[PDB]
């Protein structure tokens, strides 16, 4: 251990001595974080390999036996930094990341066990916070000898030495110190390497300042260490202890959230607002794939920003942002489109169901068959809260909680009174309906309504409803057909978009950060007269659709339709980053739903 103490000196050396010209980065970082009460430091393994190779060669060999030692010195480092003596100072956390070298999950077996592995995968579900020991002490049940154990990481049962026997010790719970542990359940990336099979989930565990760092269902990178423990031959459960974890780009986001700030954003986000093309250049962000369909193309944008959400007392609150329908003949690009749309969302879930992929479209509470006691299992809508709703096959959605969609879209909630739990839980999720209409183009010579299940009311529940009609028509094709062979090889259209990147167009991983950005600032609002304009526009929309109904035609319009078009205003306005909205500003939102009014006229 004095060998380990020489290693201790080696790391104290490592910190005090190291230089990037000229400040000692970790050293600054310490006194920086001690007032953060971070009590942790993120160290490049490359500044380490650059400092002394030796210590890594032995670190990479049995890091488990060293990582705590590495901390016992830097926790001492704070002692020689934080304050001078001649409290209480918590035992440090360390989080180390490195560029390293990526390894795929399916190939992880034996071998590399008990070493470092950088890798990504994606988390499925977060385990509840579980607190674990840091310090504990004990008096003897018989001789009353006072023991003090420092419980360190990374099982180990309590030592019995002062009948006395066999092991007469019970924890002094009053004086003990503690830490949280996460128990990540995380899954391999969707792309590799499923081969034919199902995606694996390998279990890992956070602690301290690592906890709650990562959302359920977001792409992430963990480094950690591959290890095993029994957990009822020898057949012990595979797992990875976690150091250090870093979000895949960004992800940051959560919570409240982040910028941070990198000032060039405000300017670059304001210049966007000074670009008259910005609304439309967002439209040109959405489909490098899809040439044309500019209408619905303008329709996607306004959703993601979030629309008006105003909470006015009493508890009455109106939703945002809205709903959209991609229903139309196959060839619409709407699934390809949607597979753009979800990748655009900062946080969302792609549902072609039924519900996705295996998800109860609404959270279905299911008993833990072990230790009984129903617990809510989460849901696609639930996890997608404050994010996009993706729906295919909406012709086929679960009929019982189809209504929970009929509800959650509107009341921004789902009430579960089932079993024990009565909690009404938030889905503020904004739906985009991509289903294929009954019989394709055959509902066009028929009543276009009742197309969606057996009721027209679903349309009212939705907002921006759009029927995409592609006739086989000339030259609108020959140009997109021309667009095609370019799109494929050699991405002759995907190069042509990179000079529009330099000339005009957005990068769209940017578009995430844009829509994340302007959704966290307070809700935009129209001046009075555009609203009264919504009044004389709609009095004629409604007038028109009673007069249209002079033929006794069954149908379509509501008073949530006018309001629907309202939210589109604050959407398109939230583009502007402006607390107000101009008359014409609102007006192209009007022309934007105006096609849906003729969808009512067809």
């Amino acid at each position: 251990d004095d060998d380990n103490t020489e290693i201790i000196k080696s790391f104290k050396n490592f910190i005090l001595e190291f230089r990037l010209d000229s400040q000692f980065i970790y050293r600054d970082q310490l006194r920086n974080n001690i007032l953060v009460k971070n009590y942790s430091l993120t160290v490049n393994m490359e500044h380490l390999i650059g400092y002394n190779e030796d210590i890594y060669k032995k670190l990479s060999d049995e890091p488990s036996d060293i990582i705590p030692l590495f901390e016992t010195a830097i926790t001492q480092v704070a002692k020689r930094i934080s304050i001078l003596s001649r409290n209480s100072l918590p035992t440090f956390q360390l989080i180390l990341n490195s560029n390293a070298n990526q390894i795929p999950l399916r190939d992880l077996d034996s071998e590399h066990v008990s070493k470092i592995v950088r890798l990504s995968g994606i988390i499925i579900s977060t385990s509840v916070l579980s607190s674990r020991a840091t310090y504990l002490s004990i008096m003897c049940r018989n001789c009353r000898h006072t023991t003090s154990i420092t419980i360190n990481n990374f099982t180990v049962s309590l030592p019995r030495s002062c009948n006395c026997g066999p092991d007469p010790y019970i924890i002094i719970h009053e004086s003990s110190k503690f830490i949280d542990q996460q128990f990540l359940k995380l899954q391999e990336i969707p792309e590799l390497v499923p081969v034919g099979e199902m995606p694996r989930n390998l279990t890992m565990t956070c602690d301290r300042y690592l906890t709650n760092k990562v959302i359920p269902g977001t792409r992430v990178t963990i480094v950690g260490i591959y290890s095993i423990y029994n957990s009822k031959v020898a057949i012990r459960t595979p797992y990875i202890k976690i150091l250090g974890i870093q979000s895949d780009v960004e992800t940051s986001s959560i919570w409240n959230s982040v910028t941070m700030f990198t000032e060039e954003e405000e300017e670059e986000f304001l210049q966007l607002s000074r670009n008259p093309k910005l609304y439309e250049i967002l439209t040109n962000s959405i489909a490098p794939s899809i040439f044309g369909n500019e209408d619905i193309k303008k329709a996607i944008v306004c959703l993601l920003m979030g629309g008006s959400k105003k909470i006015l007392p009493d508890g009455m609150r109106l939703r945002g942002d809205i709903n959209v329908l991609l229903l139309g003949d196959p060839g619409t690009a709407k699934s390809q489109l949607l597979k753009f749309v979800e990748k655009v969302s900062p946080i969302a879930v792609y549902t072609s169901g039924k519900g996705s992929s295996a998800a109860g479209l609404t959270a279905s509470v299911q008993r833990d068959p072990m230790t009984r006691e129903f617990y809510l299992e989460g849901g696609a809508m639930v996890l997608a809260d404050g994010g996009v709703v993706c729906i295919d096959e909406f012709d086929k959605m679960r009929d019982e909680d189809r209504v929970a969609i009929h509800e959650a879209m509107e009341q921004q909630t789902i009430s579960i009174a089932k079993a024990g739990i009565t909690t009404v839980l938030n889905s503020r999720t904004s739906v985009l309906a991509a289903a294929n209409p009954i019989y394709g183009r055959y509902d066009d010579l028929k009543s276009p309504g009742d197309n969606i299940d057996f009721q027209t009311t679903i349309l009212s529940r939705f907002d921006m409803i759009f029927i995409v009609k592609d006739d086989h028509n000339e030259e609108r094709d020959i140009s997109i057909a021309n667009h095609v062979i370019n799109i494929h090889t050699g991405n002759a259209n995907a190069m042509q978009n990179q000079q529009e990147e330099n000339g005009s167009e957005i990068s769209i991983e940017k578009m995430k950060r844009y829509i994340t950005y302007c959704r966290l600032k307070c809700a935009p609002r129209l001046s009075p007269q555009a609203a009264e304009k919504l009044s004389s526009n709609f009095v004629t929309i409604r007038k028109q659709l009673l007069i249209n109904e002079l033929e006794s035609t069954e149908r379509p319009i509501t008073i949530r339709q006018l309001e629907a078009i309202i939210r589109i205003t604050e959407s398109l306005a939230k583009l502007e980053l402006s607390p107000i909205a101009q008359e014409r500003h609102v007006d192209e939102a009007i022309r934007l739903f105006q096609a849906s009014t003729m969808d009512a006229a067809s």
């Binding site: 916070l129 607190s131 674990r132 020991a133 840091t134 504990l136 180990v156 049962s157 309590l158 019970i170 009053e174 003990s176 503690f178 830490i179 565990t205 959302i215 359920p216 423990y229 029994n230 009822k232 959560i254 919570w255 105003k310 009493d314 946080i347 959270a363 989460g378 209504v403 929970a404 509800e407 509107e410 009341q411 009430s415 009174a417 089932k418 079993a419 024990g420 739990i421 009565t422 909690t423 839980l425 938030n426 309504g449 009721q455 009311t457 609002r525 129209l526 609203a531 009264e532 919504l534 009044s535 709609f538 409604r542 659709l545 009673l546 069954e554 509501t558 008073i559 339709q561 309001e563």
Partner: protein
Amino acid sequence: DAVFGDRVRRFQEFLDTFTSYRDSVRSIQVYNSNNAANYILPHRIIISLDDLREFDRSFWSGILVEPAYFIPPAEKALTDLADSMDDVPHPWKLSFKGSFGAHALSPRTLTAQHLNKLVSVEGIVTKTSLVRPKLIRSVHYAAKTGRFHYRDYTDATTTLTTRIPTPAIYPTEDTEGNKLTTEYGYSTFIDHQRITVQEMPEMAPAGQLPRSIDVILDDDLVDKTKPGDRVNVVGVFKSLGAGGMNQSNSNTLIGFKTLILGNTVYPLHRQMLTDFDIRNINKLSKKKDIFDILSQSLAPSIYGHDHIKKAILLMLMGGVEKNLENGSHLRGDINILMVGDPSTAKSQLLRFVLNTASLAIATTGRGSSGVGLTAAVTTDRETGERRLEAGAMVLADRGVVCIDEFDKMTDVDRVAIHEVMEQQTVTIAKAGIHTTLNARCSVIAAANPVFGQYDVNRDPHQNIALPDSLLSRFDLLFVVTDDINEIRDRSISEHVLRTHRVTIPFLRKYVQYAKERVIPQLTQEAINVIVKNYTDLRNDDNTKKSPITARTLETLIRLATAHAKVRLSKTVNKVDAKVAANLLRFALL
């Protein structure tokens, strides 16, 4: 533990200085003996922590910080003091208040440092682990050597401080070997419980679900609070249990399930009317247009539908009750349903009945199992006892059930729903326990037209969506048309637009008071009219539509009685009946 006595003599100064606590101390010491002069008091005291910074801050902080080292001698100090009080002719307890804090936090987050410290933590009560009494002190009587003999047993859950594993056996013939009989009716048993609390679902940060945590309730704290209630629960968060390291089992990371001991458990949102307030309640009560007034303020955004509003308040009173002697009750609470084209504001209208109404819980369709049915928690949980748990409708007893899509609920649920309204109870055979428990509840729902916008065109038959006896129990069926008037549509627009751009809380403070004070009974004046009215219905309302039953008349009783509570008249009066005759017209036309 000299310091233990030091905390006590430090706090001893606090005894009588200031003495403002000794008032209620003495008060307990008196009303107990006043119940002893009868022909019940809890022993514990609310201490606003606010005062303690005025003596020792150095003592103050630790009370939160390391209560195991501080709270038990001051605990001892309450008892010490009170014992120094009269008269000759128990361990007590504490609560405090807050005045917080660090230690201000919600259940959504806790530990590491947050552990082992006094904390206030608030929220939903579920699932209510049910009551069992618990063993603490042992006592026995020797013979013929006589005397009186005893032990004191201490669970890890009792007190705070770690102590040797007392449990679990009776001392049983302590030397010399004399027989020792249990002293039952002597030795101490405090009841114990463990009650989880789910953080408020709506205040949840993200798609991440609600996480409840348990809090142990000793002595009084039990039976104070049912599941589902909003409660600030204060106490000290214990580190409990072995770390899996007690034994070789199990070799694993997991461990240290933990909870909070003590302390206060306040409900939140009853109410407190003083004098000056209720004087306003009655000052307004004198005015004769106030019914309509109260009706209008219900829906700040919503247009009109004042007849529906009135109907709602009429349900908000409860319309009294009358229980027969040696026979079945006459239901006085009011059950109604909404129906109409989408965007009627029906669901959103329900969300107003979500907050002011002082409970109960609302549901979107599904629903079940059996809703308010317990559905028999199985098996046990715990210690070999099969248990039930509060269902939705049960939790809603004497409160408002509301339903989004009562038309979309299962046909199988509907069975118990009949059981919810006429029978007005809950019958449970399932495993099981045969209890018939009171389901008496005010229930309102909304249903959409079975098919499209034809709600207006089609007859009520087939427009029901939920036949049949379901229709009978409904005091009112409200058809609300989406029908277009551009004249109206202008109005429809402007208030909707100034939306995004007569007081309700007091309305709750008033309604609550009108419940318990007072019930109107009846006068024959309403009777001399509404009879004429009912037969008038039967000889007319059948030349227009259907249905008509005796029950729909029994609603005249309930309706009139509701407005009777609205007038705060000590008795029913004819004009109230005129309010009923009002409501049923618009009910069917």
